[PDB]
Amino acid sequence: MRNQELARIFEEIGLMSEFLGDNPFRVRAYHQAARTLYDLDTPIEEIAEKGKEALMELPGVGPDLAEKILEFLRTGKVRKHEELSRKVPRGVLEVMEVPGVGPKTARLLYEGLGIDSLEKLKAALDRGDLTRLKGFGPKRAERIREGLALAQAAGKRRPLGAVLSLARSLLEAIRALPGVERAELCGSARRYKDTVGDLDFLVASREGERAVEGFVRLPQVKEVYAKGKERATVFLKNGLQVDLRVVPPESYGAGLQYLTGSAAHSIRLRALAQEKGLKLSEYGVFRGEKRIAGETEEEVYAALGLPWIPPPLREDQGEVEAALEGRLPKLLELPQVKGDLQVHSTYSDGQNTLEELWEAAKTMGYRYLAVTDHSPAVRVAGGPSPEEALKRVGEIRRFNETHGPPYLLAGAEVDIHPDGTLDYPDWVLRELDLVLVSVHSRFNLPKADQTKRLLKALENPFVHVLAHPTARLLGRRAPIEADWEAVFQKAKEKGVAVEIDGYYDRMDLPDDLARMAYGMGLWISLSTDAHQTDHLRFMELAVGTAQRAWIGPERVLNTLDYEDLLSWLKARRGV
Ligand SMILES: Nc1nc2c(ncn2[C@H]2C[C@H](O)[C@@H](COP(=O)(O)OP(=O)(O)OP(=O)(O)O)O2)c(=O)[nH]1
Ligand SMILES: [Ca+2]
Ligand SMILES: [Ca+2]
Ligand SMILES: [Ca+2]
Ligand SMILES: [Ca+2]
Ligand SMILES: [Cl-]
Ligand SMILES: [Zn+2]
């Protein structure tokens, strides 16, 4: 559909027209045309095919607008929009759209103050320049600064784990709206993508317009950006940018599929539908005018002749073909994970004692937890020394002797020196239950040198896991450059697992490299890199990553029970 694209075009024409000081009647008309297109559920092209008169039946559309609709459908553009674009630059249009600014103010700001950009706008805000205009007080001042921040965030992405719990708190409030029967967090978040744009929620309701009203008036909501009969876009007090879509309860499953995407996955499904005489839309699966499916997502997949496809797979990267042949991959599931294989403690940089870690693991129903404190070079500190590291092993063993399950594995996260040697001697490594190795320095070695360093680390027969291999920090540090094929192949041959560290701003291995490692036949270790017990919740992110990477419970260390895990760790591994 081109409905939303055209709604935007007319809205922009309205804004630019008002900026230029066109007829307020014409300005309001463009905005009403925009609302109509925003709310219109049927494709605008289907009405356009019926003719100019049919377009004019729509609320707000007259002879002028109907010709512009046809122009857009025939050429892909509207010359009027292009004409106003010649008179109104992009930066000045960006300024006017900030909440609390608007077209007329933007004109004064353009002509009198020299503000043609968000940059200048922020400069003015920060210096108090705007306070020297009539109509400007601390209330409007606060709105404009915040509007600017929201504008600048809308381009950008945040780690999934930075926003998922906040999204779930909003989901609770949405579910609690009277009139809402079901709701779900959809979009890329439901697919467990490691960074997300806006958050998208689907609601089932028989009273959609009233559900939208309740939603936009939730205590959590700060600003409404767009609102109509069945959808809204808002900004929360906590910053989150959120889209809502409402469908009738009979359509909920089709709405879930629609709003979960990816868009590429949905293109595949719509073609499969039409190839068997059906139409898939947000509202259901239809044979002619008759709705034959829609209430549940599994019913929708079934109507297309498919098994239900897990959301993390829905990227058009082989899942449609696998579903068509009745051979979807077996995927790791969160209940199958029996422990977390990288947690830190007060022996190094963690906030928790052994007792606190044990208690948290016991609450979670884990069989074990690996306490993997840093070697001295990681912390850029003096210790723990090799002697202290061994003393700690004895303490963890005594803790297990006095506590029982969940058992603590006495581990370490051992720094890899620039030359590929390890930051504990073999007499420490051999006594550890679990040896992780990782890069914490010299992140920018030439690719060939970084590769050699990692290969040399993997020579050591006491190593079990390559921890957070790329060392990336989302928003702070790029992945290290290394030949991952060479690194993974050596790890496979040596019996060393690669880690998926689900700590929210690590997400390392990323899904794509995890998919590569698992496809090459490696073992996988999941962890949260916890430094406080609240971090243990990130295991869901590591599992979601595994699912995106087509990883099953086979060759995942965390699906082994304690005895089987210790056996794996002690075994002659590799070729
Ligand atoms: N049929 C159809 N579905 C769409 C279209 N655009 C988006 N969708 C569906 C599939 C998307 O996964 C879902 C949410 O759209 P978003 O633009 O928010 O993307 P998504 O959440 O997947 O990724 P993001 O992290 O926000 O970049 O809506 C479209 O043009 N046609
Ligand atoms: Ca009309
Ligand atoms: Ca409710
Ligand atoms: Ca989204
Ligand atoms: Ca969206
Ligand atoms: Cl469902
Ligand atoms: Zn580390």
Notes on the structure:
The protein folds into 5 domains: 1-87, DNA polymerase, domain 1, CATH 1.10.150; 88-156, DNA polymerase, domain 1 (Orthogonal Bundle); 157-261, Beta Polymerase, domain 2; 262-326, 2-Layer Sandwich (Beta Polymerase, domain 3); 327-575, Metal-dependent hydrolases (TIM Barrel). By secondary structure, it is of the alpha/beta class. α7 packs across α8 and α9 (118-127) packs antiparallel against α10 (138-154). The strands form 4 sheets. The chain has a 7-stranded parallel β-sheet with strand order 11-12-13-14-15-16-17. A 5-stranded mixed β-sheet has the order 2-4-7-6-5, sandwiched between helices. 43% of the residues are buried. It contains 25 helices and 17 strands. β16, α23 (511-519) and β17 form a beta-alpha-beta unit. 44% of the residues lie in helices and 14% in strands. It binds 2'-deoxyguanosine-5'-triphosphate, calcium ion (4 copies), chloride ion (CL) and zinc ion.
Care to give the gist of this entry?
Its main location: cytoplasm. With 575 residues, the chain is α/β, with parallel strands linked by helices. The protein contains 25 helices and 17 strands.
List keywords for this structure.
17 strands, binds zinc ion, alpha/beta, 575 residues, globular, monomer, binds chloride ion, binds 2'-deoxyguanosine-5'-triphosphate, DNA polymerase, domain 1, Beta Polymerase, domain 2, seven-stranded parallel sheet, binds calcium ion, five-stranded mixed sheet
